[PDB]
Amino acid sequence: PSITNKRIVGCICEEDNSTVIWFWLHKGEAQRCPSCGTHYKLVPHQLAH
Amino acid sequence: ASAAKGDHGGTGARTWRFLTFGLALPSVALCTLNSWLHSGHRERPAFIPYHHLRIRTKPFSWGDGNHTFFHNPRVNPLPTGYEK
Amino acid sequence: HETDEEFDARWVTYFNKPDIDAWELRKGMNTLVGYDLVPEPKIIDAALRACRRLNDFASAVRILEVVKDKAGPHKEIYPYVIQELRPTLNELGISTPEELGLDKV
Amino acid sequence: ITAKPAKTPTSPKEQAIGLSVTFLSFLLPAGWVLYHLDNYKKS
Amino acid sequence: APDFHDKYGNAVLASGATFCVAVWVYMATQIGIEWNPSPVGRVTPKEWR
Amino acid sequence: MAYPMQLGFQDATSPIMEELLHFHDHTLMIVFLISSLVLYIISLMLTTKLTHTSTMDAQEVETIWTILPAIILILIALPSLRILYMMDEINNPSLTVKTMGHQWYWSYEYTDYEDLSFDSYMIPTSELKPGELRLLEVDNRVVLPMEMTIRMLVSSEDVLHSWAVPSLGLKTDAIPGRLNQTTLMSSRPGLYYGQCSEICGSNHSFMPIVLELVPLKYFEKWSASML
Amino acid sequence: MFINRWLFSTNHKDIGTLYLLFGAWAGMVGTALSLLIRAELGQPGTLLGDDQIYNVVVTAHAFVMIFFMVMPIMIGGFGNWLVPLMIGAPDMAFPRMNNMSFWLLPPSFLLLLASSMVEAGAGTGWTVYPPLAGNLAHAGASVDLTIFSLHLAGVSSILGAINFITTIINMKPPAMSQYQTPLFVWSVMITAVLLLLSLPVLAAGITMLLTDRNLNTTFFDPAGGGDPILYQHLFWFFGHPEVYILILPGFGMISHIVTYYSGKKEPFGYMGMVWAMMSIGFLGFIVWAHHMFTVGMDVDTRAYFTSATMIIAIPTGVKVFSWLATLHGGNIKWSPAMMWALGFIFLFTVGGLTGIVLANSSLDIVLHDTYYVVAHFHYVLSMGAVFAIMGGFVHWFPLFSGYTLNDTWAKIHFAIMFVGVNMTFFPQHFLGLSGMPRRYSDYPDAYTMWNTISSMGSFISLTAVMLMVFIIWEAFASKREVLTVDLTTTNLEWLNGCPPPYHTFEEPTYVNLK
Amino acid sequence: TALAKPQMRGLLARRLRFHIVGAFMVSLGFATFYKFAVAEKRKKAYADFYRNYDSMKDFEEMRKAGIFQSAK
Amino acid sequence: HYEEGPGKNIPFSVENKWRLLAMMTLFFGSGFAAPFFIVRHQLLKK
Amino acid sequence: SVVKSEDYALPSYVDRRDYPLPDVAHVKNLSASQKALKEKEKASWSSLSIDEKVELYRLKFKESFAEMNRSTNEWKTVVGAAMFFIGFTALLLIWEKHYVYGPIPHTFEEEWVAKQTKRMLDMKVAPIQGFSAKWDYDKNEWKK
Numbered sequence A: 001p002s003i004t005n006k007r008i009v010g011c012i013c014e015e016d017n018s019t020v021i022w023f024w025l026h027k028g029e030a031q032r033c034p035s036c037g038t039h040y041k042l043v044p045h046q047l048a049h
Numbered sequence B: 001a002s003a004a005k006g007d008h009g010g011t012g013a014r015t016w017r018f019l020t021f022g023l024a025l026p027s028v029a030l031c032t033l034n035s036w037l038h039s040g041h042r043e044r045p046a047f048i049p050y051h052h053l054r055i056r057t058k059p060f061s062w063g064d065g066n067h068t069f070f071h072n073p074r075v076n077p078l079p080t081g082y083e084k
Numbered sequence C: 001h002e003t004d005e006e007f008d009a010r011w012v013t014y015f016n017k018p019d020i021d022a023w024e025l026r027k028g029m030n031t032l033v034g035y036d037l038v039p040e041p042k043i044i045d046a047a048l049r050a051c052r053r054l055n056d057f058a059s060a061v062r063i064l065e066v067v068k069d070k071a072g073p074h075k076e077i078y079p080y081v082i083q084e085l086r087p088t089l090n091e092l093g094i095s096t097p098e099e100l101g102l103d104k105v
Numbered sequence D: 001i002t003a004k005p006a007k008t009p010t011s012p013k014e015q016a017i018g019l020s021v022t023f024l025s026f027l028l029p030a031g032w033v034l035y036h037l038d039n040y041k042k043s
Numbered sequence E: 001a002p003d004f005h006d007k008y009g010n011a012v013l014a015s016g017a018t019f020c021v022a023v024w025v026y027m028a029t030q031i032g033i034e035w036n037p038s039p040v041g042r043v044t045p046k047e048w049r
Numbered sequence F: 001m002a003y004p005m006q007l008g009f010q011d012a013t014s015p016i017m018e019e020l021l022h023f024h025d026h027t028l029m030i031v032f033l034i035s036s037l038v039l040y041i042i043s044l045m046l047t048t049k050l051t052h053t054s055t056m057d058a059q060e061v062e063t064i065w066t067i068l069p070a071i072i073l074i075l076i077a078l079p080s081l082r083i084l085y086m087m088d089e090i091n092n093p094s095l096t097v098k099t100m101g102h103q104w105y106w107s108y109e110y111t112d113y114e115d116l117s118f119d120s121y122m123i124p125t126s127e128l129k130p131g132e133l134r135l136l137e138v139d140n141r142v143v144l145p146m147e148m149t150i151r152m153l154v155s156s157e158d159v160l161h162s163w164a165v166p167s168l169g170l171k172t173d174a175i176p177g178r179l180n181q182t183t184l185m186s187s188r189p190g191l192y193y194g195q196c197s198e199i200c201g202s203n204h205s206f207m208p209i210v211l212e213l214v215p216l217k218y219f220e221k222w223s224a225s226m227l
Numbered sequence G: 001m002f003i004n005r006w007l008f009s010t011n012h013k014d015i016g017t018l019y020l021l022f023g024a025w026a027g028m029v030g031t032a033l034s035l036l037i038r039a040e041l042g043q044p045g046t047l048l049g050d051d052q053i054y055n056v057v058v059t060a061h062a063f064v065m066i067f068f069m070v071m072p073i074m075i076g077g078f079g080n081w082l083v084p085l086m087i088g089a090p091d092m093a094f095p096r097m098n099n100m101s102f103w104l105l106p107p108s109f110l111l112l113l114a115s116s117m118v119e120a121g122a123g124t125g126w127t128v129y130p131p132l133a134g135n136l137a138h139a140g141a142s143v144d145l146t147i148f149s150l151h152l153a154g155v156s157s158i159l160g161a162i163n164f165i166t167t168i169i170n171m172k173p174p175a176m177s178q179y180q181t182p183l184f185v186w187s188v189m190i191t192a193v194l195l196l197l198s199l200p201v202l203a204a205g206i207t208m209l210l211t212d213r214n215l216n217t218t219f220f221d222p223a224g225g226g227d228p229i230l231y232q233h234l235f236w237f238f239g240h241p242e243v244y245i246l247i248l249p250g251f252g253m254i255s256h257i258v259t260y261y262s263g264k265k266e267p268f269g270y271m272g273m274v275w276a277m278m279s280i281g282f283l284g285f286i287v288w289a290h291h292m293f294t295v296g297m298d299v300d301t302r303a304y305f306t307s308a309t310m311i312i313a314i315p316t317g318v319k320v321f322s323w324l325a326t327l328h329g330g331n332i333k334w335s336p337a338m339m340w341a342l343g344f345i346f347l348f349t350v351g352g353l354t355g356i357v358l359a360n361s362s363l364d365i366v367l368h369d370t371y372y373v374v375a376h377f378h379y380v381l382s383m384g385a386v387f388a389i390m391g392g393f394v395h396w397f398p399l400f401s402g403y404t405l406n407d408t409w410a411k412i413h414f415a416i417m418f419v420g421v422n423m424t425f426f427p428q429h430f431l432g433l434s435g436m437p438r439r440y441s442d443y444p445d446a447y448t449m450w451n452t453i454s455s456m457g458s459f460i461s462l463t464a465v466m467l468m469v470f471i472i473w474e475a476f477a478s479k480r481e482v483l484t485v486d487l488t489t490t491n492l493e494w495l496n497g498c499p500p501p502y503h504t505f506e507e508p509t510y511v512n513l514k
Numbered sequence H: 001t002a003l004a005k006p007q008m009r010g011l012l013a014r015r016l017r018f019h020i021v022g023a024f025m026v027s028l029g030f031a032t033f034y035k036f037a038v039a040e041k042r043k044k045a046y047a048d049f050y051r052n053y054d055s056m057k058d059f060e061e062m063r064k065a066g067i068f069q070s071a072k
Numbered sequence I: 001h002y003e004e005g006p007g008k009n010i011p012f013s014v015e016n017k018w019r020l021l022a023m024m025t026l027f028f029g030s031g032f033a034a035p036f037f038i039v040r041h042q043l044l045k046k
Numbered sequence J: 001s002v003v004k005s006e007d008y009a010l011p012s013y014v015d016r017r018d019y020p021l022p023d024v025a026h027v028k029n030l031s032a033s034q035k036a037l038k039e040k041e042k043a044s045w046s047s048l049s050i051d052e053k054v055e056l057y058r059l060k061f062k063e064s065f066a067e068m069n070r071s072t073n074e075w076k077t078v079v080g081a082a083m084f085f086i087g088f089t090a091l092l093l094i095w096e097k098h099y100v101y102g103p104i105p106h107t108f109e110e111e112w113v114a115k116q117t118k119r120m121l122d123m124k125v126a127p128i129q130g131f132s133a134k135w136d137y138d139k140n141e142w143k144k
């Protein structure tokens, strides 16, 4: 869930892994982590009233 | 002599294992080594029949009744002098 | 945690996926140059053929550039690999870096 | 790291200045204290 | 084109190393800096009484 | 004393100091090693095109990386601790000289038998006799009998000093209200020089030490000639 | 706006910038003080005058490089810039308090500069030992102004440590365990616990000295039952911990750089590097009496401190051997900043051993208060802590600015600095073997050659320092804008663009629990 | 004529396993050199000096030379 | 809101490189000048 | 080609031997002619010219491996400029000696060294290795 057209995702590809994989996530098709190929999708909403 | 690590703010089982292996046992081994380097038959004391020691007010309930339980003839006199 | 025959197999299987996409093509090449090994020609085969499925001549050259690089000073590896691949190469009209002139400074 | 080209390229000549000015900003005053050293002691 | 290091690499390398060698020798040998080298096989001992 | 271009330690005038030289010689063998293995392995990693950027496993190499250096370190300590306890040792001294540090000279007391006391300043460059060692020479020397065990007590009547004779392997701090004990044994006679080894103010540089070692019988006269 | 932006800030980045600037200025003063020192020793006889004016200069050189250069850049600059961006935090727990930690530092410096212009200045050494530092030898305001420098400078540090630890512990993504934070982040957390626990005891000691000079206490005065040595312990109880403070973040940066420029996706043995610094931290607290082996303390004690001081080599080894493994099968990209890291690894390991020498109470008998000591700690500080600083600075300059430096120039800088510090300090090993004492304006004839050479080195190191001021200009002059950065997938700081916006992570990162 | 299949795996592994020995060797042979060239000389040079040392013949020549204050 | 982007996130101006050289000249130079003028004043008293 | 700052958040292109197939093409936007080559790439690859093959390679990728991996002459400029600045550094030292540094002490004049040297051999300074041991006392000359 995001308030904008992108938001940075961090991917802990396996438990206890020392290194989070970071990348920008965009409105669109789903995006896969460039490490483990796990899929992520942006879900715009808001917080007006 | 202080401590300085700084909160391992994750999961417990894992941090206590870090501490088990990184600190606890390392220091049990440093300590063992420090006695495996000080250990030895250090030379046994001259005998004096000091009355405030080797107290027999009553036989013991075993051996000839004149020998302590964890007796060691090399270092532990009777009232009347060492054995042998 | 596996034999070398499993490794070689596991990767060929990855690259003979028929609805392999170019995200999966780049992934597997960029994952594979990571390892302490020049790939077996039967993988370079499988990949060169995943390019053909994907209508990307370009990446099929780049792959051959990467073979020669992972080798470094072991000069004899690339020439042997380019023997074992000669069939698949002239099957698909894949020209090598050396032929397109992209080994010139 | 990929960069653009410079927006205000600093030619050699311009570089030669900045180098000239910068070396002198350290070197000159230090010199004037260290040269008049003898004078300071006679007091 | 060729780059700064092609056009000027040797000039810089040649003329640095030369200007470097000259001023250092000169500054070491010609202005009466006192280095106080080991006297051994050099100075001839003289009586001090 | 120290001579031009000197690389290493002054020559051992006392046996303790000898012991240090050989111990120091040990410690540098290992230093010269770890520094070369690290300089070598560095260059090794940088001089290949072959690559391996995928995740690598620690446990089994991090074992060599600890158990070796722990052995390398007992090896250094084992003699370091021998030579340190050797500096204490139940020795039998025949003479007890007390030194006091002042802003900026050293006073001496030989008070076993007599009440012999005197100061010890530096020869100003202008007043050195040709042959005399700038910043090192003192008007009144510490005459000590050579080849005997001597007890030196150190204190100061003002700031901190440090009583320091490299060639004998001695350095003990002068701490006001505190009597610090060291022991002095020359294997040879001659002149043996040293300087203040704590910052005491304006003339820290210029308050040196010079021992004169001589026989016992050339000493006892020197003692009697000073009262 | 300007007064609101720079004076009144609550921006972790804008505050980092203030420190990088302060610590850059400090360095200028530190350099001058170091040149003066070697002006005086570069030939025999006397240049300024007596040991007094000489030791005010020596002393000042030490406080500025330590307290106003290395800790301000390394912790307050790179801390405040990188830490929040490496854990996806929007700023610091306590951003108002963060700014007081900055503005307490000009004052702190000015009391220092005041001290050197009042009476005959405080030439006491950086140890400030009674009874020299007392009200009979150093009568006047000088030593009081120096004690006050440190009070303010210790409040900055302790407040800033409370801020980091509370930030690194409390303000990560929920999914993120401590065990998935970068090595720098870890280095700074540990370095803040060392500060938090040692600076209070430093303060306590310099407080008893103020009340010995001013309120007629006798803490360190044998006239009233006191002991000068008591002071040495409290100060060194702080003073060992103070130096693992000065290197730990260098560890951090070095772990970062060697990783990024070897093209690796993480450094070798992450948890190894975590155990290493948590050890170096811990053992750094139980070693303080190795600075006091000629004070006249029981033999049984002296042999503990010898042995305890040497254990530190194992966990420090792990780190040397890790970096070296982080290079193993790397795609080495030969940047300036890699050069800075590589140099660190070898000149830190030189200095690191020269202090295992010193660990032996035996030798330190002869090596105490000689240049050999000066040589050890100028290899770990001048050729480590400053190499980390120039390394980091070189690698991250485009993140803070948005512009590139000229890499050729920046290797020309590395080149000259390498030749300068090694020629400065390699001869100081020889001097202290030949038994040249510390804190002397003038030396016996014998020691001249090395002292000439040592000072020539200090004139090469000056060319370096001047070049780096003109290299910072060029870059700003030229304004080449960073376009694209590699290795972003594993280096979150670079993800918000060079330079990143006033407000970062306004919407926090997504990290899910698997 | 066909080229024969070379070693294609763990090429960097092989390079290290070979050279790790070469660095042991360099160092450990710098070990020997220091023992011979320096340490075993020091021990030989102190023992050789002190073996036939008369500290009275030292004191005597030093006394004739006019260096001492206590011994004219 | 304060200015975003390259040359905007500093408390000086990089809008003209020759004013910038004057600025860095003073900043760094003053700091290096300081110890010298301080040693002067200590010798210039007594 | 042309890259903007503003898209730091978008997948960018890069030449890198450990990432040989990057996330995007070098040339995103195709002319009329480039579109019809991309069309020819859907057919047999034997029906392309060498010219037509090089071009496809240069759309997907900027520098070739041999181009991305070529050595330079940086070092010449890096070594020779260092040696100029280390050179410069002596001009300061010569200035320092000529205008700043007073006359050195008299215990450094030829005479004194000679007298002071014997005085040192007369007290047997460092007689096991360092000084007096480098002197022959019978032949009365430095040892050969």
Ligand SMILES: CCCCCCCCCCCCCCCCCC(=O)OCC(COC(=O)CCCCCCCCCCCCCCCCC)OC(=O)CCCCCCCCCCCCCCCCC
Binding pocket: F007, F008, F009, F028, F031, F032, F035, F036, F039, G350, G422, G423, G426, G427, G429, G430, G453, J129, J130
């Ligand atoms: C430009 C800077 C100046 C450099 C200085 C060079 C010196 C040139 C002058 C003439 C030179 C003649 C001798 C050359 C050896 C010089 C140093 C040495 O080894 O001296 C040995 C000892 C002292 O030992 C002695 O006791 C000296 C005895 C020498 C006997 C040899 C036979 C006779 C020839 C020598 C004459 C003296 C004999 C009389 C004396 C007898 C006993 C004292 O010094 C020490 O302890 C120094 C402590 C430093 C430890 C740092 C660790 C190493 C860092 C780098 C390692 C990798 C290399 C990369 C390296 C890269 C990084 C640097």
Ligand SMILES: CCCCCCCCCCCCCCCCCC(=O)OCC(COC(=O)CCCCCCCCCCCCCCCCC)OC(=O)CCCCCCCCCCCCCCCCC
Binding pocket: G002, G003, G006, G017, G018, G020, G021, G022, G024, G025, G106, G107, G109, G110, G400, G401, G472, I009, I010, I011, I012, I013, I023, I024, I027
């Ligand atoms: C309308 C009136 C407003 C009134 C308010 C005041 C006046 C405002 C102007 C009017 C308002 C309009 C807006 C100004 C636009 C900029 C114009 C300018 O260039 O104006 C110049 C300004 C601002 O000056 C500065 O900022 C100082 C830096 C000087 C330039 C050198 C550049 C450094 C290069 C090295 C960087 C590399 C490292 C970092 C690299 C990393 C990059 C991020 O001058 C001043 O009026 C000084 C004001 C103080 C500001 C804080 C400075 C931080 C102090 C650091 C400690 C010093 C050490 C001493 C310590 C103490 C010892 C005694």
Ligand SMILES: CCCCCCCCCCCCCCCCCC(=O)OCC(COC(=O)CCCCCCCCCCCCCCCCC)OC(=O)CCCCCCCCCCCCCCCCC
Binding pocket: F042, F043, F046, F047, F048, F049, G332, G334, G339, G342, G343, G346, G411, G414, G415, G418, G419, J069, J070, J071, J072, J073, J074, J075, J078, J079, J082, J083
């Ligand atoms: C080399 C180990 C260094 C050890 C030192 C450690 C301790 C001290 C720190 C010291 C650490 C510094 C080491 C410097 C060596 C770098 C040379 C290099 O590989 O050059 C870099 C390359 C990069 O090449 C590329 O564009 C991409 C190709 C991929 C990388 C190439 C190299 C990879 C290895 C392959 C080698 C070939 C096979 C050989 C096979 C093996 C041969 C036997 O650029 C070029 O072509 C040339 C551009 C180089 C510009 C920098 C010069 C450095 C000057 C420093 C002077 C300091 C001392 C004072 C000096 C001046 C004052 C007088």
Ligand code: HEA
Binding pocket: F034, F068, F069, F070, F072, F073, G243, G244, G246, G247, G290, G291, G309, G310, G312, G313, G314, G316, G317, G318, G320, G348, G349, G350, G351, G352, G353, G355, G356, G358, G359, G360, G364, G367, G368, G369, G373, G376, G377, G380, G381, G385
């Ligand atoms: C960043 C600063 C810094 C660092 C990192 C160090 C690191 C060390 N220091 Fe030092 N030190 C100072 C700054 C520093 N020091 C300062 C300023 C003083 C003087 C204060 C003053 O008096 O003015 C001082 C003084 C000092 C003394 C007092 C000397 C004297 O006053 O006479 C001693 C004694 O033990 C000492 C020891 C050590 C040790 C054991 C390390 C260790 O941390 C080094 C460990 C690292 C290595 C050894 C290299 C890596 C390890 C390996 C490659 C493993 C293999 C090694 C072996 C098998 C041995 N230091």
Ligand code: HEA
Binding pocket: G020, G023, G024, G027, G028, G031, G034, G035, G037, G038, G058, G059, G061, G062, G065, G066, G070, G073, G125, G126, G127, G374, G378, G381, G382, G385, G386, G389, G390, G393, G421, G424, G437, G438, G439, G440, G441, G458, G461, G465
């Ligand atoms: C961090 C600490 C540090 C640093 C860096 C230095 C650097 C140097 N020091 Fe110092 N020194 C000490 C701390 C330090 N020193 C201490 C603690 C003592 C003991 C004090 C005492 O006895 O009481 C000492 C003592 C000391 C002595 C002995 C004094 C005596 O006993 O008489 C000498 C003699 O030459 C000396 C020389 C030098 C030289 C030539 C440098 C040169 O190597 C420096 C060259 C210049 C630089 C390295 C500049 C770097 C500037 C920057 C990096 C800023 C730029 C950054 C940005 C823009 C972000 N030092």
Ligand SMILES: CCCCC/C=C/C/C=C/CCCCCCCC(=O)O[C@H](COC(=O)CCCCCCCCCCCCCCC)COP(=O)(O)OCC[N+](C)(C)C
Binding pocket: C001, C002, C003, C004, C007, C035, C036, F041, F052, F055, F056, F057, F061, F064, F065, G321, G324, G325, G328, H009, H010, H012, H013, H016, H017, H020
């Ligand atoms: C004090 C000085 C002492 C020096 C210490 C010396 C260490 C000795 C070690 C020597 C072995 C060399 C190993 C490093 C090269 C990389 C090895 C590699 O690439 O191995 C892969 C590692 O990846 C995996 O599993 C993942 C696990 C990784 C395991 C391999 C890496 C371990 C070593 C890395 C440390 C380098 C440090 C050197 C510099 C200090 C495994 O692949 P495979 O199973 O298919 O291989 C099969 C090959 N066979 C059939 C010929 C055996």
Ligand SMILES: CCCCCC/C=C\CCCCCCCCCC(=O)O[C@H](COC(=O)CCCCCCCCCCCCCCC)COP(=O)(O)OC[C@@H](O)CO
Binding pocket: B001, B002, G298
């Ligand atoms: C490694 C840590 C262990 C600490 C616990 C040990 C404490 C006490 C043990 C002493 C018991 C013996 C009592 C009789 C002897 C006097 C005390 C003593 O032995 O220590 C004296 C006073 O120091 C002192 O306790 C100094 C005062 C104590 C300071 C302790 C140091 C650590 C402090 C930091 C702790 C912070 C934690 C937070 C607080 C809860 C100093 O030595 P002297 O004896 O003058 O030596 C005279 C010579 O002639 C030697 O021959």
Ligand SMILES: CCCCCC/C=C\CCCCCCCCCC(=O)O[C@H](COC(=O)CCCCCCCCCCCCCCC)COP(=O)(O)OC[C@@H](O)CO
Binding pocket: D001, D002, D003, D004, D009, D011, D012, D015, D016, D019, E004, E012, E016, G404, G406, G407, G408, G409, J077, J080, J081, J084
């Ligand atoms: C002996 C004493 C004399 C001094 C020795 C010389 C010192 C150093 C000069 C170094 C010359 C440049 C180094 C080569 C490459 C890096 C910088 C450069 O030349 O600048 C390039 C300008 O391009 C272009 O020719 C566009 C046109 C601008 C050219 C910029 C350089 C021209 C001037 C250089 C000479 C300065 C003379 C100094 C005299 C005091 C831009 O950088 P790139 O090469 O695109 O890559 C860098 C990447 O970060 C970007 O993605």
Ligand SMILES: CCCCCC/C=C\CCCCCCCCCC(=O)O[C@H](COC(=O)CCCCCCCCCCCCCCC)COP(=O)(O)OC[C@@H](O)CO
Binding pocket: G093, G094, G095, G096, G097, G098, G151, G152, G155, G158, G162, G199, G200, G203
């Ligand atoms: C002889 C003279 C020597 C000089 C001494 C004087 C020096 C400084 C005096 C100035 C101090 C008074 C000013 C008030 C400071 C309060 C700071 C504070 O209390 O900060 C709080 C956090 O600190 C917390 O709790 C935890 C930290 C609380 C500490 C409170 C302030 C400490 C000041 C004294 C430090 C002494 C050091 C003690 C150890 C030796 C709040 O954080 P802020 O970012 O503010 O806001 C964040 C918002 O979310 C709040 O709504």
Ligand SMILES: CCCCCCCCCCO[C@H]1O[C@H](CO)[C@@H](O[C@H]2O[C@H](CO)[C@@H](O)[C@H](O)[C@@H]2O)[C@H](O)[C@H]1O
Binding pocket: D026, D027, D028, D029, D030, D031, D032, D035, G035, J092, J093, J095, J096, J099
């Ligand atoms: C250690 C840090 C710095 C080391 C290197 C410094 C080299 C000094 C650079 C030149 O600086 C000086 O130059 C002149 C001397 O050459 C001085 O002129 C002095 O001498 C002239 C003639 O001798 C006079 O006419 C001038 O007014 C003046 O008095 C001048 O004032 C001073 O700035």
Ligand SMILES: C[C@H](CCC(=O)O)[C@H]1CC[C@H]2[C@@H]3[C@H](O)C[C@@H]4C[C@H](O)CC[C@]4(C)[C@H]3C[C@H](O)[C@]12C
Binding pocket: B014, B017, B018, B021, B022, B023, B026, F059, F062, F063, F064, F066, G271, G272, G275, G318
């Ligand atoms: C258990 C702990 C953390 C690993 C993890 O939980 O992820 C690991 C990481 C660092 C390890 C230590 C270091 O790697 C250094 C030592 C390595 C030796 O082979 C065993 C003991 C040794 C002292 C290790 C014990 C244990 O294996 C540690 C402490």
Ligand SMILES: C[C@H](CCC(=O)O)[C@H]1CC[C@H]2[C@@H]3[C@H](O)C[C@@H]4C[C@H](O)CC[C@]4(C)[C@H]3C[C@H](O)[C@]12C
Binding pocket: G230, G233, G289, G300, G301, G304
């Ligand atoms: C140095 C300090 C006293 C401080 C002071 O006098 O003010 C004392 C307090 C506790 C002491 C330690 C503890 O008594 C325990 C150890 C006892 C051993 O005989 C010596 C090492 C040993 C680890 C001690 C070393 C040192 O003397 C310590 C650390």
Ligand code: CUA
Binding pocket: F101, F102, F103, F104, F160, F161, F162, F196, F197, F198, F199, F200, F201, F203, F204, F205, F207
């Ligand atoms: Cu008395 Cu220094």
Ligand SMILES: [Cu+2]
Binding pocket: G239, G240, G243, G288, G290, G291
């Ligand atoms: Cu310490």
Ligand SMILES: [Mg+2]
Binding pocket: F162, F197, F198, G294, G368, G369
């Ligand atoms: Mg001391």
Ligand code: NA
Binding pocket: G040, G041, G042, G043, G044, G045, G046, G047, G441, G442, G443
């Ligand atoms: Na001098």
